[PDB]
Amino acid sequence: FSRLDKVEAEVQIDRLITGRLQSLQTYVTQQLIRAAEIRASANLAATKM
Amino acid sequence: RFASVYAWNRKRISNCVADYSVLYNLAPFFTFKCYGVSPTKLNDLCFTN
């Protein structure tokens, strides 16, 4: 923001916001897969017990 | 006097405070476009050399 005028700086930051935001949606989606595997092993430890 | 094309001179500016106001306020300036920065934000930055 301290090197480019406001008309153009709105192009670069959007190319950076949409990357950091997509890199955070990937993390959540991977956790949803993993949490569905532990749920499949907490339903086997509850049967072994 | 300005040097020719084939033997262009080079002057080192350092250890000084630069005011670009007098630079950008010269009337016959015609071709003035900047690549990495914007000309209106040259007065609030510090450069290495």
Measured between beta carbons, which residues in chain A are less than 8 angstroms from residue B38? 3-5, 8
DSSP state of B6: T
Measured between beta carbons, which residues in chain B are less than 8 angstroms from residue A2? 41, 44-45
CA atoms of A1 and A12, how far apart (whole Å): 10
Measured between beta carbons, which residues in chain B are less than 8 angstroms from residue A3? 36-38, 41, 45
Experimentally, how was this structure solved? cryo-EM
- Quick one: CA dihedral A26, A30, A33, A39, positive or negative? negative
A33's CB contacts (< 8 A; 6+ apart) are: none
**Token code pair at residue A49:** 């017990």
Partner-chain contact A3 B37, CB within 8 Å: yes
CA atoms of B49 and B40, how far apart (whole Å): 19
CA angle B10, B16, B18 (to 5 degrees): 85
Q: What resolution does the deposited structure have, in angstroms?
A: 3.3
Side chain identity at residue A47, one-letter code:
T
- Quick one: CA dihedral B9, B12, B39, B1, positive or negative? negative
- Which of these, A9, A12, A4, A1, lies nearest to B39 by C-alpha position? A4
**Token code pair at residue A27:** 């993390």
